Amino acid sequence: QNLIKQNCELFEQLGEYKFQNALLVRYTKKVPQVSTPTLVEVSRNLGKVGSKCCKHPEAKRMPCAEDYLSVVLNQLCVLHEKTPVSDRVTKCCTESLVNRRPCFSALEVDETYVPKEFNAETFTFHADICTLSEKERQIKKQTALVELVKHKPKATKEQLKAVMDDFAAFVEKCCKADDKETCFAEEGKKLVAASQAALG
Numbered sequence: 001q002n003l004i005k006q007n008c009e010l011f012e013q014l015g016e017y018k019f020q021n022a023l024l025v026r027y028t029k030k031v032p033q034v035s036t037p038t039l040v041e042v043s044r045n046l047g048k049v050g051s052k053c054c055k056h057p058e059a060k061r062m063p064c065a066e067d068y069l070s071v072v073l074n075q076l077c078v079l080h081e082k083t084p085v086s087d088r089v090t091k092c093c094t095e096s097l098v099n100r101r102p103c104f105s106a107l108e109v110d111e112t113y114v115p116k117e118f119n120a121e122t123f124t125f126h127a128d129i130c131t132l133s134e135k136e137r138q139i140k141k142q143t144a145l146v147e148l149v150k151h152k153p154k155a156t157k158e159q160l161k162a163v164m165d166d167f168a169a170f171v172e173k174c175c176k177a178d179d180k181e182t183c184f185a186e187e188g189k190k191l192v193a194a195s196q197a198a199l200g
């Protein structure tokens with residue numbers, strides 16, 4: 001049961017957004033090839049959910065979470081049905097009742113990533129990213145790193161932290177100039193030009 005507390009204490013130690021950074025890499029790797037928005041659908045909720053439970057003792061801690069915990073799963077039942085993706089997760093999408101959770105929890109990492117996306121032309125930044133709806137930044141500023149995982153899982157957290165400081169600056173100028181529109185493209189491409197070559 002402690003497994004639940006470990007996250008409860010960690011959630012407060014880090015936060016709501018950061019906490020997702022970890023769960024994300026875990027959820028993403030857990031079910032590869034399940035679309036980005038999807039993983040965020042539940043992830044974004046699970047993370048923010050931490051706020052729903054943070055005041056009552058261990059006694060009312062779990063119970064307070066069970067509320068959404070039971071709701072989410074119930075939603076995935078029909079939700080997943082609409083999205084016929086995956087296998088091990090799909091085949092075990094509709095059981096004979098009484099063995100829905102067990103079949104899920106019992107299931108471990110699969111990493112059965114057969115397909116891939118080599119579309120470099122796609123994916124853009126655009127200026128709207130820092131003009132049309134600021135709140136959007138919440139989701140926008142997150143998938144960028146996720147893409148790197150899908151393209152090549154297994155990253156260096158120690159090194160990632162470093163870039164986190166440099167990224168804070170990039171975004172700053174990214175939207176704080178007269179001709180930011182061109183910068184987003186020019187500057188946005190430059191970064192890709194250096195990465196395309198190599199990283200180390």
Ligand SMILES: Cc1ccc(SCCNc2ccc(S(=O)(=O)NC(=O)c3ccc(-c4ccc(F)cc4)cc3)cc2[N+](=O)[O-])c(C)c1
Binds near residue numbers: 038080
């Ligand atoms: C249609 C579809 C398919 C996949 C996905 S991505 C997420 C895959 N689903 C998933 C993954 C792991 C676990 S798990 O490993 O058994 N549970 C956890 O990892 C877990 C982590 C943290 C907490 C936690 C609880 C309380 C708290 F305060 C903090 C953390 C609880 C459970 C459970 C599910 N699930 O039920 O769908 C999508 C999106 C759609």
